[PDB]
Amino acid sequence: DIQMTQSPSSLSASVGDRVTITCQASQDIDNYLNWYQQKPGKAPKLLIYDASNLETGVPSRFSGSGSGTSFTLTISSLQPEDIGTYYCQKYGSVPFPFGQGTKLEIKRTVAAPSVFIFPPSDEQLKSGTASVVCLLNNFYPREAKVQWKVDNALQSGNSQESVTEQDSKDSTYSLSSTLTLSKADYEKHKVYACEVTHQGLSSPVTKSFNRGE
Amino acid sequence: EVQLVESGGGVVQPGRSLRLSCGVSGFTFSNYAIHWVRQAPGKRLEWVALISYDGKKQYYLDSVKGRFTISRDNSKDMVYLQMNSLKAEDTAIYYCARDRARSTGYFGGIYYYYYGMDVWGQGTTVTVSGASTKGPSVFPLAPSSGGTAALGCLVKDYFPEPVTVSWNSGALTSGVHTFPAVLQSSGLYSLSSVVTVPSSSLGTQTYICNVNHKPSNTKVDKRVEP
């Protein structure tokens, strides 16, 4: 029973750098190996077949190599369009096993985020809830800290975050933080703030608003 | 030009059944084998089923060997996957995919090679849960003349995934950031979709988010204004 072992699991590199991902078959499979590229949001896409032949559309920066038990996908000049997860697979027979995949991302020049804050809507407030949203837009690297403050009282655990996959247009990330309180707990306080610490920031930037103002 | 499109998907509780469909357009459907391959939220790609270009179900994943049955119609260009006795392990996104191997000439019987899938469909989401489907509430995320303004829509309290969000009925695409859904403690997904537009447009252009949640037949238009 043949197992496919991909490596590394994740991988990051600057634009134009060389990048290598390797697939290992538990036993000799000759050249029956395909590579697939799953871009963020989209279905997987065949790139290399027969270990070394690339599909009609794939650019020159992609090459496949190796045989038997060891296979290599190489991107000689990494582009942000190549952002996604890569899978190897042994075709020809059941059960067409895939490798666990390799997430590939872009190292970029540091970029400071554009921060926005959104008060709850009246419609939602009528329902008994309040969601305040802090938006961190187009930043690099991915590591960013969002700190909610309710009248300078530090919040923790009562919020939830979501980060976009790396955009190929500018190699940046975006983050959305949601602080959810009851309408009753919400209308007891005045100043709601989101404080953002990021590598591209000289010092924590705060975006705040006053309830009812 | 060659495309595959999946239909079906949604909640179905553990123990019972749903039927997935896949229609194709752009190639000669009769001379290609078809795969069903799935992807669980934390798992790799997992091949599920395979039917020959004619009539042969050369394979099922061992974990579905008697549960799923894959079918095909070369007159309607259609491939189906009947899923019975579903479990949480079957919860995933299901794609139908064309095998790269064609057919060529007969001579002997048909041959059946399998070069292992080249073109995939968009996929359809199947959630196996005892939980109830809920439609999302859609709330505005409004701003407050110079600078870059940000607008948004909060798609809150829905189940299951996914929802789609467009802007101005597909006209506005640039600057849109739709965030991956977050699983709240309530067991309901919540999502935001933002867009950065020039502030000057806030008094001229109209900004509307379109939220679609198929599993509950939800389609909401929301006007976001400062």
Numbering used by the authors:
A (entry chain L): 1 to 213
B (entry chain H): 1 to 144, 149 to 230
What does the paper say about this structure?
In the RV305 clinical trial, RV144 vaccine-recipients who had previously received the initial ALVAC-HIV + AIDSVAX B/E gp120 immunization regimen (0,1,3,6 months) and remained HIV-1- uninfected were boosted with ALVAC-HIV, AIDSVAX B/E gp120, or ALVAC-HIV + AIDSVAX B/E gp120 6–8 years later. In this paper we demonstrate that late (6–8 year) boosting of RV144 vaccinees with ALVAC-HIV and AIDSVAX gp120 B/E increased the VH chain gene mutation frequency and expanded clonal lineages of CD4bs antibodies with long HCDR3 regions. The epitopes of the vaccine-induced CD4bs mAbs described here appear to overlap those of other CD4bs antibodies and that of bnAb B12 in particular. Electron microscopy of negatively stained complexes showed that the vaccine-induced mAbs DH576 and DH583 bound an open form of Env, consistent with a gp120 being used in the vaccine-regimen, and the images were consistent with the CD4bs epitope mapping.
Abs DH576 and DH576.2 shared with the CD4bs bnAb B12 sensitivity to 3 CD4bs-critical mutations (D368R, R419G, T455E) and 2 of 3 additional mutation sensitivities (K282V and I467K) suggesting these vaccine-induced CD4bs mAbs have a specificity more similar to that of B12 than to that of the non-bnAb CD4bs mAb, B6 which is not sensitive to D368R, R419G and T455E mutations. The most heavily mutated member of the long HCDR3 CD4bs DH576 B cell clonal lineage was DH576.2 (VH nucleotide mutations of 10.33%), but the additional mutations did not broaden or strengthen HIV-1 tier 2 CRF01 AE.CNE8 neutralization with respect to neutralization by less mutated lineage members such as DH576 (VH mutations of 7.33%). We analyzed by negative stain electron microscopy (EM) a CH505 SOSIP.664 trimer bound with DH576. A 3D reconstruction showed DH576 bound to an open trimer—that is, to Env in a conformation related to the one stabilized by CD4 binding. The bnAbs CH103, CH235, CH31, VRC01, and PGV04, as well as CD4 itself, project away from the center of the trimer, avoiding interference with adjacent gp120 subunits in the closed trimer conformation, whereas DH576 may require the open form in order to avoid overlap. The DH576 Fab has an orientation with respect to Env quite similar to that of the B12 Fab, but turned by ~90° about its long axis. The CD4bs bnAb B12 interaction with gp120 depends upon an aromatic residue at the apex of the HCDR3 loop, aromatic residues around the base of the HCDR3 region, a tyrosine at the apex of the HCDR2 loop and positively charged amino acids in the LCDR1. An alignment of the DH576 inferred UCA and naturally occurring clonal lineage members with the B12 heavy sequence showed that, like B12, the DH576 clonal lineage contained an aromatic residue at the apex of the HCDR3 loop, aromatic residues around the base of the HCDR3 and a tyrosine in the HCDR2 loop. The HCDR3s of B12 and DH576 protrude at different angles and when DH576 is superimposed on the B12-gp120 complex, the HCDR3 of DH576 sterically clashes with gp120.
